[PDB]
Nucleic acid binder design. Structure first.
Ligand SMILES: [K+]
Ligand SMILES: [K+]
Ligand SMILES: [Mg+2]
Ligand SMILES: [Mg+2]
Ligand SMILES: [Mg+2]
Ligand SMILES: [Mg+2]
Ligand SMILES: [Mg+2]
Ligand SMILES: [Mg+2]
Ligand SMILES: [Mg+2]
Ligand SMILES: [Mg+2]
Ligand SMILES: [Mg+2]
Lengths: 140, 81, 181, 214, 129, 23, 48
RNA sequence: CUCCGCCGGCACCUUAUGAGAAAUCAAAGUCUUUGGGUUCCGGGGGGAGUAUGGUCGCAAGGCUGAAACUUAAAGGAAUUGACGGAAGUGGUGGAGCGAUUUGUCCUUUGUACACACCG
RNA sequence: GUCUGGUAAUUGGAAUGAGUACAAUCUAAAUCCCUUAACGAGGAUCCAUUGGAGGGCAAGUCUGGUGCCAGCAGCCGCGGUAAUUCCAGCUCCAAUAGCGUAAUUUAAGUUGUUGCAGUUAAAAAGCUCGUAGUUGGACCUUGGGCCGCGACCCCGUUACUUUGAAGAAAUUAGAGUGCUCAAAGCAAGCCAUCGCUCUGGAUACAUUAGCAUGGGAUAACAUCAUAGGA
């Protein structure tokens, strides 16, 4: 059983403190390892397109996901960022500013794309959605 | 349950087990109701009777026979039967 | 420091926890169509107000009938519910406040009462009439259709004196047409 | 049209009964659904879910369909039927009959002052089926049904306006979720409360009441 | 060891009532158990009970009338002010209409309603309904 | 792989790492 | 992998212009239309 | 030796009025009607009882014990079928939370297979 | 047939503010608002969007294109020629002047004090002793009546509880009050008043620790036959 005594407040508090480290979410929050991530705790980061690459999907699916290799500016960390919206790889060029965001699963890989948790959202200051919908044009 | 106006608000008032005082539910199909007839002098059956209802729980335990025999001793004493 | 930072403000509604439930969508649309609402947020804010009133009434019901706070705040709540026409005279208890629905609050809008008074042909015609500044409550013209009308102000809902439907001069459409003629 | 095969069915056909609570008083088993239709006319009917169950065979899989059906008059009577059949239409038809056959009384009470008509569960009540445990807490008038979709439907057909609920276990197993809620509603005329402390008068059972007819 | 004699008394009574027994023997006896039993009897949830003196910790033989759904202790005996009685009754009682929480107060051992009537707080012994 | 043999394999790599880093 | 086929299908898809249709009422009137359709008058988009 | 009791012990049989996901358990019961006391200890699956630090040991090793990263299951009980280099079709009613089962008396048995061992 | 409903870039007159603008008002000066001449709607182009339409989850097993590619997909999945899921058109759905996307709360009784687990799913130390810690059997002034819910009669502590004083304001809860409503604000109201309503500008909450009052059931500590008592 568990301790129930009126004078056992310290026992209960210390036990809860020690057991909270078993929870994955608690330990992810309070370990400090999220500051060693490429984004270092920020929702978005900017980076330089180093080279356009195509990485194969998982086993059941057969596709080339056509991501981008991005070197961040805040820390110089190289990441792979997915480019959604069919045809948007042609808006991506080497040595071009891009705003990266998370792939929506908090550093966990998403879908059939292995090892990618980052998507390109903005290129050269123009959103990829605007370029897909032809609402704006990429500056020369 | 009575309303503050003064009306009964329950659909019905269920029977209680005569031995364990437990409420006899509508789907308690192991429950029964025994009518013990009343006899006057010479052994003739009057046409009146006492009623006992036993829940399915007390019958399932097996104490139904002893419970019913004790209840009948008590009422027989009281009504001179 | 900026003094304007001390002015209070707050939210008037919440969104549903389940966005795509058929039954709730049908009920909300039925109420919206019945009362000519512009969106679901107008019904959601009425539900928010009803929620706060209901919470207050429930909290005083969970206190003794001699608790001086329940005597005082329940009297104030009953006064407020009788003032805006939400409760009858026989309904003079905190229990009846818990039974109020968003229908009761929507029935006290200036749009609903303008429609039911015969001034407008439909609930939507009532909404436009109020938003066109044709309606006054007492001497004050009200262009806000979510205006909650008190029982003492119900008999003073009337057409504006500056409005063409309330003894005023003709509107620009009519005047332009006669000038053309 | 209908030939009653039970003694209870005969009396219901003739009209010796007017309400289903006379059957409830004596805990009689109801085995003909025409009895419930005769005595509880305001019954609605809703199919909660259809589930495919597969029995592995030598040649592929034998698929049958399980239908869950809830009936009720929204005035203190609710019933749940589960029928599995080779055809969906007959699975639903069989479940409606079973749901009517399991129409049980539901006790309704007041959260606070007993003003107006009962609107909530009289007391805290719990039902369990499989790993699913369903708790129902009496709620103040106007609270509505604070429950998941599956128990909300059964509470609406039971005639309960206000109730707080909590559930634990795999409520994703809808058969258990609905059965646990129905068991919770059934165990509501069974909690002894001081208002039921008055001794039972033991009226005559309809079997002995109409032995002249039967 | 025996830590709470009240818990053993109430649990034995609960088990006997569930079993349909009409008499339950309580050992050991104590003033707190007789005081809890008096509250129980006053509210009509039990019948006669008899203290049997054995020149030791006593014995209590209680008549059961089938009106008990549950009786139990709360351990620890948490401090309950008059204002926290509402929260405790919501936690432990089936409804706001029935059920009793038993408190030990400097004014005596009493049910929560009687504690409200004298505005006296204390510690929770248990509950019955 | 059987858990006993996995443990034996891991004890062998550890012997090796120990005899390398320490010596 | 090969990046040459990026934009293949969207470039292949023939361009179909949008029909110039009447605007639907906006706001309270739109809710009036929806209320009428689903309360005073197969799914909403059944291919009948 | 025989019979009847009492206390204590290793156990066994039946039964559900109980509990349980069930297997099953007379405790694994007296739990959403949740509180007798107390110790240790778990928080999806791997990485991993691995690295490192510390400590004990002659050593073998023991005790304490991560992270990065990876993954959508892993796992438990039970059912039907299939397989074994194992043995010799409704209805209604009943049982089961249920898949199912009884009825229908190839069967029993094991299974980590279910595209079903050509696994 | 009549009665009553919904539909049409049909057909008609009404209505009006977005905008423009005399002016006044505003204002330190300006400006915005409020007010208001004149003007200002028919496809009232004075043109509403953001996301979706396999399931979760509301809405299509419509049409064309692509054909395990391009792509979508939070998850399960879709795409190999009949794609309800990609690219589009049409239609429909949700919210709506907003909506989509990328730490924390809820959901989570998946941290569990209330309130989770540990035979087989993750989890009882191999076993026992043992300090601290936590937890510890029962027992001691009760009845009784009277007056009248109080009372009457026959120089050990502490926890706990009760009451009181404090615990800034703002924030929160909440009384009053028609800023046109509302979010607000702390104003205001009065038949019109050389003034008045002393106008209002409440109240509640505020752990723990501290101070004080009553209570002693429960419990803790200290004693507890040199009482060697007085
Ligand atoms: K023995
Ligand atoms: K059968
Ligand atoms: Mg527990
Ligand atoms: Mg783990
Ligand atoms: Mg069957
Ligand atoms: Mg749908
Ligand atoms: Mg499409
Ligand atoms: Mg768990
Ligand atoms: Mg194992
Ligand atoms: Mg294990
Ligand atoms: Mg003691």
């Amino acid at each position: 059983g568990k301790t129930r005594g009126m004078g056992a407040g310290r026992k209960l508090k210390t036990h809860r403190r020690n057991q909270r480290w078993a929870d994955k979410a608690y330990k992810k929050s309070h370990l400090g390892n999220e500051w060693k991530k490429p984004f270092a705790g920020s929702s978005h980061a900017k980076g330089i397109v180093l080279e356009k690459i195509g990485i194969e999907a998982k086993q059941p699916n057969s596709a080339i996901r056509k991501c981008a290799r991005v070197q961040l500016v805040k820390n110089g960390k190289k990441i792979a960022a997915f480019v959604p919206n069919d045809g948007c790889l042609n808006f991506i060029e080497e040595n071009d500013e891009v705003l990266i965001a998370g792939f929506g699963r908090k550093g966990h890989a998403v879908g059939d794309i292995p090892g990618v948790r980052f998507k390109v959202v903005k290129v050269s200051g123009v959103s990829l959605l605007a370029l897909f919908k032809e609402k704006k044009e990429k500056p020369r | 349950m009575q309303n503050e106006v003064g009306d009964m608000v329950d659909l019905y008032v269920p029977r209680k087990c005569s031995a364990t005082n437990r409420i006899i539910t509508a789907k308690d199909h192991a429950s029964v109701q025994i009518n013990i007839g009343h006899v006057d002098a010479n052994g003739l059956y009057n046409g009146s009777f006492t009623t006992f209802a036993l829940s399915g729980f007390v019958r399932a335990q097996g104490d139904a026979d002893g419970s019913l025999d004790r209840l009948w001793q008590q009422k027989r004493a009281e009504i001179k039967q | 420091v900026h003094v304007n930072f001390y002015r209070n403000y707050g939210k008037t509604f919440k969104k549903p926890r389940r966005p795509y439930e058929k039954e709730r969508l049908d009920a909300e649309l039925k109420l919206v169509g019945e009362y000519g609402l512009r969106c679901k947020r107008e019904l959601w804010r009425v539900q928010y107000a009803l929620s706060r009133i209901r919470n207050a009434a429930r909290h005083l019901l969970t206190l003794d009938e001699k608790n001086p706070r329940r005597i005082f705040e329940g009297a104030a709540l009953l006064r407020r519910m009788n003032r805006y026409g939400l409760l009858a005279e026989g309904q003079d208890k905190l229990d009846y406040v818990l039974a109020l629905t968003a229908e009761n609050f929507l029935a006290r809008r200036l749009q609903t009462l303008v429609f039911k008074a015969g001034m407008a042909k439909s609930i939507h015609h009532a909404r436009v009439l109020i938003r066109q500044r044709h309606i006054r409550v007492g001497r004050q013209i009200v262009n806000v259709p979510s205006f909650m009308v008190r029982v003492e102000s119900e008999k003073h809902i009337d057409f504006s004196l500056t409005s063409p439907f309330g003894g005023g001069p003709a509107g620009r459409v009519k005047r332009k047409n006669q000038k053309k003629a | 049209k209908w030939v009653p095969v039970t003694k209870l069915g005969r009396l219901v056909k003739e009209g010796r009964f007017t309400k289903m609570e006379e059957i409830y008083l004596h805990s009689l088993p109801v085995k003909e659904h025409q009895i419930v239709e005769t005595l509880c006319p305001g019954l609605k009917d809703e199919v909660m879910k259809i589930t495919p169950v597969q029995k592995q065979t030598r040649a592929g899989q034998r698929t049958r369909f399980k239908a869950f059906v809830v009936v009720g008059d929204s005035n203190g009577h609710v019933g749940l039927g589960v029928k599995c059949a080779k055809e969906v239409a007959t699975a639903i038809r069989g479940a409606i009959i079973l749901a009517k056959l399991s129409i049980v009384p539901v006790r309704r009470g007041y959260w606070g002052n007993k003003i107006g008509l009962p609107h909530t569960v009289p007391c805290k009540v719990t039902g369990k089926c499989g790993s699913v445990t369903v708790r129902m807490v009496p709620a103040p008038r106007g609270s509505g049904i604070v429950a998941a979709r599956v128990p909300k439907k059964v509470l609406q057909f039971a005639g309960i306006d206000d109730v707080f609920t909590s559930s634990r276990g795999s409520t994703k197993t809808l058969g258990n979720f609905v059965k646990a809620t129905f068991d919770c509603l059934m165990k509501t005329y069974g909690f002894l409360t001081p208002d039921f402390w008055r001794e039972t008068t033991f009226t005559k059972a309809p079997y002995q009441e109409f032995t002249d007819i039967l | 060891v025996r830590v709470s004699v009240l818990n053993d008394a109430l649990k034995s009574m609960y088990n006997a009532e569930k079993r349909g027994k009409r008499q339950v023997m309580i050992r050991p006896s104590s003033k707190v158990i007789i005081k809890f039993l008096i509250v129980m009897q006053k509210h009509g949830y039990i019948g006669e009970f008899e203290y049997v003196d054995d020149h030791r910790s006593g014995k209590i033989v209680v008549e059961l009338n089938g009106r008990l759904n549950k009786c139990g202790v709360i351990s620890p005996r948490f401090d309950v002010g008059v204002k926290e009685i509402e929260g405790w009754t919501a936690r432990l009682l089936p409804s706001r209409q029935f059920g009793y929480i038993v408190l030990t107060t400097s004014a005596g051992i009493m049910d929560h309603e009687e504690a409200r009537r004298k505005n006296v707080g204390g510690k929770v012994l248990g509950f019955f309904y | 792989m059987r858990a006993k043999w996995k443990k034996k394999r891991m004890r062998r790599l550890k012997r090796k790492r120990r005899k390398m880093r320490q010596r | 992998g090969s990046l040459a086929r990026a934009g293949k299908v969207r470039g292949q898809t023939p361009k179909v212009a949008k029909q110039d249709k009447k605007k639907q009422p906006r706001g309270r009137a739109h809710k009036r239309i929806q209320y009428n359709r689903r309360f005073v008058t197969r799914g909403p988009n059944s291919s009948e």
